[PDB]
Design an enzyme around this catalytic site. Structure first.
Site, PDB file in Angstrom:
ATOM      1  N   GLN A  34      -7.242  -2.243   9.776  1.00  0.00           N
ATOM      2  CA  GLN A  34      -8.400  -1.384  10.000  1.00  0.00           C
ATOM      3  C   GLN A  34      -9.495  -1.825   9.029  1.00  0.00           C
ATOM      4  O   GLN A  34      -9.216  -2.148   7.876  1.00  0.00           O
ATOM      5  CB  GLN A  34      -8.026   0.085   9.785  1.00  0.00           C
ATOM      6  CG  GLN A  34      -7.087   0.616  10.862  1.00  0.00           C
ATOM      7  CD  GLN A  34      -6.793   2.096  10.723  1.00  0.00           C
ATOM      8  OE1 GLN A  34      -7.694   2.931  10.794  1.00  0.00           O
ATOM      9  NE2 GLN A  34      -5.524   2.429  10.525  1.00  0.00           N
ATOM     10  N   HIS A  84       0.808  -1.209   0.000  1.00  0.00           N
ATOM     11  CA  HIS A  84       0.000   0.000   0.000  1.00  0.00           C
ATOM     12  C   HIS A  84       0.843   1.262   0.000  1.00  0.00           C
ATOM     13  O   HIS A  84       2.045   1.225   0.279  1.00  0.00           O
ATOM     14  CB  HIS A  84      -0.993  -0.008   1.187  1.00  0.00           C
ATOM     15  CG  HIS A  84      -0.445   0.510   2.485  1.00  0.00           C
ATOM     16  ND1 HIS A  84       0.747   0.084   3.030  1.00  0.00           N
ATOM     17  CD2 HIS A  84      -0.981   1.366   3.387  1.00  0.00           C
ATOM     18  CE1 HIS A  84       0.919   0.654   4.213  1.00  0.00           C
ATOM     19  NE2 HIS A  84      -0.116   1.437   4.452  1.00  0.00           N
ATOM     20  N   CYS A  90       3.904   5.465   5.359  1.00  0.00           N
ATOM     21  CA  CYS A  90       3.963   4.275   6.201  1.00  0.00           C
ATOM     22  C   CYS A  90       5.390   3.736   6.171  1.00  0.00           C
ATOM     23  O   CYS A  90       6.049   3.771   5.132  1.00  0.00           O
ATOM     24  CB  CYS A  90       2.998   3.207   5.677  1.00  0.00           C
ATOM     25  SG  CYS A  90       2.993   1.657   6.612  1.00  0.00           S
ATOM     26  N   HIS A 113      -5.303   5.606   1.666  1.00  0.00           N
ATOM     27  CA  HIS A 113      -4.466   4.584   1.051  1.00  0.00           C
ATOM     28  C   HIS A 113      -4.799   4.215  -0.383  1.00  0.00           C
ATOM     29  O   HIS A 113      -5.923   4.392  -0.847  1.00  0.00           O
ATOM     30  CB  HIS A 113      -4.572   3.244   1.798  1.00  0.00           C
ATOM     31  CG  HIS A 113      -4.418   3.318   3.283  1.00  0.00           C
ATOM     32  ND1 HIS A 113      -5.354   3.899   4.114  1.00  0.00           N
ATOM     33  CD2 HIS A 113      -3.475   2.787   4.095  1.00  0.00           C
ATOM     34  CE1 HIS A 113      -4.994   3.716   5.373  1.00  0.00           C
ATOM     35  NE2 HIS A 113      -3.858   3.044   5.389  1.00  0.00           N
ATOM     36  N   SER A 135      -5.785   6.091   9.749  1.00  0.00           N
ATOM     37  CA  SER A 135      -4.368   6.344   9.490  1.00  0.00           C
ATOM     38  C   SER A 135      -4.131   7.414   8.432  1.00  0.00           C
ATOM     39  O   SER A 135      -3.140   8.141   8.492  1.00  0.00           O
ATOM     40  CB  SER A 135      -3.668   5.052   9.060  1.00  0.00           C
ATOM     41  OG  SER A 135      -3.557   4.143  10.139  1.00  0.00           O
TER      42      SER A 135
END
Length: 153
Positions: free
Chosen positions: A121, A49, A103, A147, A144
């Site tokens: 998640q 991702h 990330c 994505h 977060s």
């Protein structure tokens, strides 16, 4: 595959702003001109991702910016840009993830390894399990950030 061409889970036929039918997946948020086709989900999937964080992220900081200050709007703009760049062929998912993902997984070119339900998640998990091998999601929002998900296995 046999005698039938029902759209896969989450896929639906829509009409583009410029007048052509296209297909949208309401789980992965992917959009494409190509008909996606024409049974349960996988037990486990492997995904990579590219995450773009914003000021409202659970942890507004990353290896490429100690203090994330971009708005969610700006984050979505970047995500849409990366998606367009990958689809055009000018950039590849792995390269962009290794350079721009907020990330730490950027170190592994975005690879998160394999996982099962209940480990990521929810929005991310839902999109991941609705992707088929080799498919890429559209913008997926989690606590977060935003994505872009690529299912590799």
């Amino acid at each position: 595959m046999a005698d039938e061409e029902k759209l896969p889970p989450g896929w639906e036929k829509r009409m583009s702003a410029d007048g052509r039918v296209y297909y949208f997946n309401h789980i992965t948020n992917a959009s494409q001109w190509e008909r996606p086709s024409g049974q349960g989900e996988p037990a486990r999937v492997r995904c990579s991702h590219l995450l773009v964080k914003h000021s409202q992220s659970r942890r507004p900081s990353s290896w490429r910016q100690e203090k994330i200050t971009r708005t969610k709007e700006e984050a979505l703009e970047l995500i849409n840009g990366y998606i367009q760049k990958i689809k055009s062929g000018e950039e590849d998912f792995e390269s962009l993830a290794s350079q721009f993902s907020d990330c730490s997984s950027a170190k592994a070119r975005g690879d998160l390894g394999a996982f099962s339900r209940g480990q990521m998640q929810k929005p991310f998990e839902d999109a991941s399990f609705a992707l088929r091998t080799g498919e890429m999601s559209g913008p997926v929002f989690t606590d977060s950030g935003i994505h872009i998900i690529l299912r590799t296995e």
